[PDB]
Amino acid sequence: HHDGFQTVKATIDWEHPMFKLYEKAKRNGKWNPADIDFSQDQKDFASLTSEEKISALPLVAGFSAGEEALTLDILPMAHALARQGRLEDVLFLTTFMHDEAKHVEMFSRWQQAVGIGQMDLSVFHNDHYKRIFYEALPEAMNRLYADDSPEAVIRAATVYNMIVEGTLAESGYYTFRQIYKKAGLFPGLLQGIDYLNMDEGRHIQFGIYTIQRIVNEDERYYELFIRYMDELWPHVIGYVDYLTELGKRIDYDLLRHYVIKQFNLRKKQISRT
Amino acid sequence: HHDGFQTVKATIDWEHPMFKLYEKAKRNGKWNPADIDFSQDQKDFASLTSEEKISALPLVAGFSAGEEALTLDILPMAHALARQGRLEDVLFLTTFMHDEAKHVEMFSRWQQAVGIGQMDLSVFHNDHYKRIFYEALPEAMNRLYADDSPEAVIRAATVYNMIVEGTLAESGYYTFRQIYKKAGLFPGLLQGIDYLNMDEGRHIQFGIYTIQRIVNEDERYYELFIRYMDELWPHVIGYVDYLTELGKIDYDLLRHYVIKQFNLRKKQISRT
Numbered sequence: 001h002h003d004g005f006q007t008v009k010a011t012i013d014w015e016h017p018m019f020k021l022y023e024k025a026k027r028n029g030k031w032n033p034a035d036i037d038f039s040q041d042q043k044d045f046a047s048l049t050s051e052e053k054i055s056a057l058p059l060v061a062g063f064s065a066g067e068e069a070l071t072l073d074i075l076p077m078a079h080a081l082a083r084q085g086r087l088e089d090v091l092f093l094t095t096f097m098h099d100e101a102k103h104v105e106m107f108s109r110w111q112q113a114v115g116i117g118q119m120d121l122s123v124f125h126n127d128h129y130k131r132i133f134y135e136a137l138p139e140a141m142n143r144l145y146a147d148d149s150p151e152a153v154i155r156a157a158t159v160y161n162m163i164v165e166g167t168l169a170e171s172g173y174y175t176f177r178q179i180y181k182k183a184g185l186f187p188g189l190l191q192g193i194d195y196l197n198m199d200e201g202r203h204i205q206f207g208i209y210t211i212q213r214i215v216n217e218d219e220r221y222y223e224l225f226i227r228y229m230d231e232l233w234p235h236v237i238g239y240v241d242y243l244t245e246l247g248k249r250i251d252y253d254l255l256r257h258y259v260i261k262q263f264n265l266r267k268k269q270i271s272r273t
Numbered sequence: 274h275h276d277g278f279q280t281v282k283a284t285i286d287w288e289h290p291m292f293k294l295y296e297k298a299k300r301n302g303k304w305n306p307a308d309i310d311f312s313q314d315q316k317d318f319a320s321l322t323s324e325e326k327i328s329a330l331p332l333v334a335g336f337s338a339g340e341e342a343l344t345l346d347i348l349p350m351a352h353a354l355a356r357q358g359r360l361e362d363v364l365f366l367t368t369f370m371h372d373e374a375k376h377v378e379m380f381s382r383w384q385q386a387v388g389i390g391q392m393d394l395s396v397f398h399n400d401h402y403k404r405i406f407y408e409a410l411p412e413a414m415n416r417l418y419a420d421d422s423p424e425a426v427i428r429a430a431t432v433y434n435m436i437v438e439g440t441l442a443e444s445g446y447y448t449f450r451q452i453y454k455k456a457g458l459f460p461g462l463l464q465g466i467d468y469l470n471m472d473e474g475r476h477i478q479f480g481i482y483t484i485q486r487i488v489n490e491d492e493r494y495y496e497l498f499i500r501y502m503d504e505l506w507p508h509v510i511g512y513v514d515y516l517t518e519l520g521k522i523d524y525d526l527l528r529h530y531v532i533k534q535f536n537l538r539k540k541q542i543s544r545t
């Protein structure tokens with residue numbers, strides 16, 4: 001039941017940082033996956049040999065499931081914040097959810113255009129990927145439906161925004177650029193990564209804001225954050241190591257360093273105070 | 274746990290009705306309430322006498338809370354359809370939810386701009402309004418977290434889309450355009466309501482699709498639908514009586530429009 005409603009008793013808190021992020025989202029989130037021209041990606045992918053074709057599919061496999069997972073699995077967080085009456089957070093999170101929807105859309109349109117929609121790409125999800133995306137992500141998020149304690153929220157934001165988005169996805173978009181922008185391939189996909197990467201800059205700020213406002217209330221949660229971050233690293237690097245051993249069948253060692261740098265960069269964006 | 278992912282094993286169902294609605298929402302849902310100029314609404318409202326001022330507030334009280342409730346209360350529908358694997362529905366529902374947020378945002382900006390933001394407008398929610406918006410809507414939606422049965426999804430769509438949106442809000446925005454476009458008042462608010470009314474045309478199609486695809490399985494659900502509508506009617510009309518009495522403009526035109534809207538919704542679902 002609703003006790004009452006903030007916009008009948010008062011107003012939106014116009015100064016709230018998440019309301020300010022919501023405003024920037026509507027401003028900067030107008031791109032439409034449907035408007036991306038994929039006709040050259042179609043040609044590029046066709047003129048690839050069968051061996052140069054496989055090279056692209058693992059990254060794509062991780063993005064398409066990842067974004068679909070991201071779209072489904074933000075709903076518990078939106079629910080938990082709404083129940084706590086953090087209305088500006090909810091407003092913003094509508095833009096987050098609809099961004100992820102566009103992310104899933106873009107990757108699927110790409111698959112359709114280049115002619116692999118009928119192909120099952122689950123075979124490039126190794127155990128470590130499954131542990132993050134099939135299991136640890138929805139488990140941490142669905143927890144919020146019955147346990148919205150600071151500890152559960154910090155863990156949801158850590159898995160979702162700091163590890164999946166902030167470490168894995170940031171690194172894979174960097175990687176996709178590294179490899180394909182230089183080879184001059186898949187411009188429609190690269191336009192779409194570009195849009196996606198701008199969206200995700202907002203998503204991470206919500207994750208930082210959420211972890212930090214929980215840390216601010218009790219510095220003991222800073223150690224929970226660092227700990228959960230470290231608990232997921234083995235699967236982060238286990239997914240990375242698997243992708244490397246596939247591509248090795250392109251400086252993998254400067255991609256591996258970027259994943260590590262991203263991981264440590266996220267850590268340093270939360271302070272104990 | 275995720276069993277797998279549709280866009281790794283296959284693709285989006287590009288021909289699904291809710292994906293087509295999703296595609297349309299993106300095309301047609303670009304408005305930003307931050308861009309509406311409310312400077313004249315401020316002046317108009319200040320030009321009103323104290324008695325004229327309070328004549329506007331109950332309808333605004335109904336709208337602001339209603340859009341707030343609607344933003345919060347679609348989330349369980351998103352979850353339950355997501356849990357059933359209806360990805361294209363979920364994609365659409367992201368545009369539905371972001372629309373409602375813009376709707377709440379608009380009315381709050383209007384209250385801020387005309388200088389009534391500090392004023393608690395709950396006083397204009399009577400017992401019938403509270404029955405619907407504080408209680409029945411959130412009960413119906415939250416049910417879906419533990420009971421996604423046909424009966425539960427029908428009852429959620431019936432209350433959310435068919436009564437709240439399709440009967441009460443449709444009639445309210447009709448009511449407001451009629452009174453204030455004729456008075457030449459609140460041009461920024463009226464512009465936001467035009468935008469809102471376009472959004473909401475997509476929303477009602479999702480609710481029609483949802484209720485009819487379930488009814489299509491079993492015509493026992495058509496009778497469930499009709500009953501859930503009639504169950505809510507005494508509160509719809511009780512709130513309409515409350516506002517008309519407050520006001521006391523052709524009140525009987527407006528009141529008959531609500532009944533029209535309610536019958537209209539009934540007739541958008543067919544037994545087969």
Ligand SMILES: CCCCCCCCCCCC(=O)O
Nearest residue numbers: 062063066169171172175255
């Ligand atoms: C050695 C490869 C380095 C790149 C690692 C990033 C892999 C992550 C793929 C994207 C997963 C996702 O967020 O959807």
Ligand SMILES: CCCCCCCCCCCC(=O)O
Nearest residue numbers: 335336339340442444445527
């Ligand atoms: C004077 C006749 C009243 C017409 C119905 C007005 C109902 C207004 C409340 C709408 C709230 C909402 O569903 O967002």
Ligand SMILES: [Fe+2]
Nearest residue numbers: 070165200203
């Ligand atoms: Fe994201």
Ligand SMILES: [Fe+2]
Nearest residue numbers: 127128238239
């Ligand atoms: Fe391993």
Ligand SMILES: [Fe+2]
Nearest residue numbers: 373438473476
């Ligand atoms: Fe709506």
Ligand SMILES: [Fe+2]
Nearest residue numbers: 400401511512
């Ligand atoms: Fe009554």
Ligand SMILES: [Mn+2]
Nearest residue numbers: 067070100103
């Ligand atoms: Mn994304």
Ligand SMILES: [Mn+2]
Nearest residue numbers: 340343373376
């Ligand atoms: Mn609305």
